[PDB]
């Protein structure tokens, strides 16, 4: 029913996310929610999706790794409207999915005035 | 959009089969759709919604981008350089613009 759940379910194709096989790296405290550095890695993933559970529109990015990628690491900077959980979901070539989740405290809210 | 200037940092050569780190940035407001004007009305979204990096025509990464990616979107990822040729970087704007950058890579 929630948007995170709906997005999560579309990604998993109905399977439950496992754990292990993923690293989600985010600051404990993000001073500036307009620009929060995030790194994800998931050896062997065909894709990693990033969700921000407390944002008005939770979807952040989907990283689709192609054949020319040396490994399944991606780093970017994101907006967080407020203190919240950031979720990474990685899907393997066999279609199994793994989840990592972490709390990011935010001082300055992102997403715009 | 105007002044969407790509900046890519990547070695100009590598040993055959070696990993290189790619850093790809472009200047863009990424108007989120959540910002309010002086009157409290929402300012409509207009972002880069997709970024691709190809090495010698084969995909390195393809990123579906949403409004929570920051202003001046930044992507860092790792490419396996098996042979010489070029990286091609493409950013797709909500407004219909397509931004491109091309970077040569040698094998030494």
């Amino acid at each position: 029913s929630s948007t995170v759940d709906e997005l999560t379910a579309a990604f998993t194709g109905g399977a439950a996310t496992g754990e292990g096989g993923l690293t989600l790296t985010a600051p404990e405290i993000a001073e500036n929610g307009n620009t929060v550095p995030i790194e994800v890695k998931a050896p062997g993933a065909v894709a990693i999706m990033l969700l921000a559970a407390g944002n008005p529109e939770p979807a952040v990015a989907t990283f689709n790794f192609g054949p020319a990628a040396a490994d399944q690491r991606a780093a970017t900077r994101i907006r967080l409207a407020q203190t919240q959980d950031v979720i990474a979901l990685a899907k393997m070539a066999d279609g199994s999915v793994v989840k990592a989740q972490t709390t990011v405290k935010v001082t300055i809210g992102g997403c715009g005035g | 959009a105007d002044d969407a200037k790509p900046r890519v940092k990547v070695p100009s050569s590598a040993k055959a089969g070696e990993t290189v780190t790619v850093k790809a940035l472009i200047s863009h407001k990424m108007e989120s759709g959540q910002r309010k004007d002086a009157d409290g009305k929402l300012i409509p979204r207009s972002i880069i919604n997709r970024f691709t990096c190809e090495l010698n025509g084969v995909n390195v990464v393809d990123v579906a981008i949403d409004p929570a990616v920051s202003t001046n979107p930044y992507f860092e990822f790792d490419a396996k350089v098996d042979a010489a040729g070029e990286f091609k970087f493409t950013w797709y704007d909500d407004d219909g613009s397509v931004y491109e950058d091309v970077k040569p890579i040698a094998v030494a």
Side-chain angles (χ1 to χ4, degrees):
Chain A
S1 266
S2 78
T3 302
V4 159
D5 286 347
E6 285 166 339
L7 287 168
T8 303
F11 195 71
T12 69
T17 68
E19 22 207 302
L22 217 199
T23 305
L24 169 60
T25 302
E28 183 188 339
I29 302 172
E31 291 216 318
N32 202 313
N34 296 289
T35 176
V36 183
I38 302 295
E39 184 181 67
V40 288
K41 26 185 83 151
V46 294
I48 300 163
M49 187 166 71
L50 201 60
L51 303 181
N55 276 0
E57 180 175 345
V60 182
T62 308
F63 303 93
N64 196 307
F65 297 99
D71 51 57
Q72 296 74 46
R73 189 186 70 92
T76 190
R77 302 190 70 103
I78 74 169
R79 295 153 161 170
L80 297 171
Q82 43 139 17
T83 293
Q84 59 185 279
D85 291 341
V86 180
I87 299 161
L89 298 166
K91 181 182 297 193
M92 304 292 131
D94 66 4
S96 53
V97 175
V98 296
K99 179 178 96 183
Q101 175 171 343
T102 201
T103 294
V104 182
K105 291 184 166 53
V106 179
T107 313
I108 299 152
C111 288
Chain B
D2 303 298
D3 295 310
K5 161 93 211 85
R7 202 314 171 206
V8 176
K9 180 151 29 263
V10 59
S12 295
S13 67
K15 177 92 183 313
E18 185 202 326
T19 300
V20 303
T21 290
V22 184
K23 298 173 179 177
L25 170 97
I26 192 165
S27 59
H28 192 104
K29 285 191 292 300
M30 302 291 282
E31 193 57 58
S32 72
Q34 303 297 336
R35 220 176 111 240
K36 286 162 174 189
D37 64 14
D39 233 72
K41 314 179 165 200
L42 289 181
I43 304 169
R45 149 197 167 151
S46 186
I47 64 167
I48 286 161
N49 55 240
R50 185 181 182 214
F51 162 78
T52 63
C53 177
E54 295 185 348
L55 178 54
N56 303 148
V58 167
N59 190 263
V60 180
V61 77
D62 180 351
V63 188
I65 301 166
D66 308 310
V69 169
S70 74
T71 299
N72 302 336
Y74 177 80
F75 305 104
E76 176 181 332
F77 49 92
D78 309 307
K80 186 163 192 278
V81 190
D82 288 329
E86 65 186 14
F87 294 101
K88 193 165 296 188
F89 301 89
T90 312
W91 295 260
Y92 299 87
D93 199 310
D94 279 344
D95 86 352
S97 301
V98 176
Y99 315 115
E100 288 172 27
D101 197 6
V102 172
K103 287 284 187 287
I105 190 150
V107 164

